[PDB]
Amino acid sequence: RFTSNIKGLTQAARNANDGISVAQTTEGALSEINNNLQRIRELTVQASTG
Amino acid sequence: RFTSNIKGLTQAARNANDGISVAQTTEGALSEINNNLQRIRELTVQASTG
């Protein structure tokens, strides 16, 4: 039973590592989208002037 | 009567030895069946992740 438990826990640890990886990828993409929206806000602030 | 008894007991001991043999063989086979099921459990724990 202990062998089963330790093998399962190790594999679950690797799975959690993969989860951290996918979270990192999504966060990087979102950070870039944030930069793009920031530049769009620059352009809006400039264009609002008459 | 004593001679008949001692011969019978000797043959009985030999039979019990044969029984120990068959039990050992069965236990070895069951041991590796357990090993394979353990690996299956590890694989399933891996496969449960999304």
Question: Could you walk me through the main structural features you see in this protein, from its secondary elements to its overall organization?
Answer:
This is part of a larger assembly, with two copies of chain A (50 residues). Chain A has one helix at 2-47. The relative contact order of chain A is 0.07. Chain A has one helix and no strands. Chain A starts with a helix and ends with a helix. By secondary structure, chain A is mainly alpha-helical. The longest helix of chain A is centred in the middle third of the chain and has 46 residues, at 2-47. It is classed as structural protein. Keywords: Bacteria flagellar filament, motility, flagellar polymorphism, structural protein. Cryo-EM structure of the enteropathogenic E. coli O127:H6 flagellar filament. Chains A, B: Flagellin.
Provide the descriptors you would attach to this structure in a database record.
part of a larger assembly; 2 chains; about 50 residues; mainly alpha; 1 helix
Largest protein interface, residues of each chain: A-B, 10 and 6 residues
The proportion of residues in beta strands of chain A is under 5%
| Number of strand elements of chain A | 0
Largest sheet of chain A: none
Order of helices and strands of chain A: H
Which percent range fits the helix content of chain A? over 70%
PDB class: structural protein
Keywords: Bacteria flagellar filament, motility, flagellar polymorphism, structural protein
Entry title: Cryo-EM structure of the enteropathogenic E. coli O127:H6 flagellar filament
Chains A, B: Flagellin
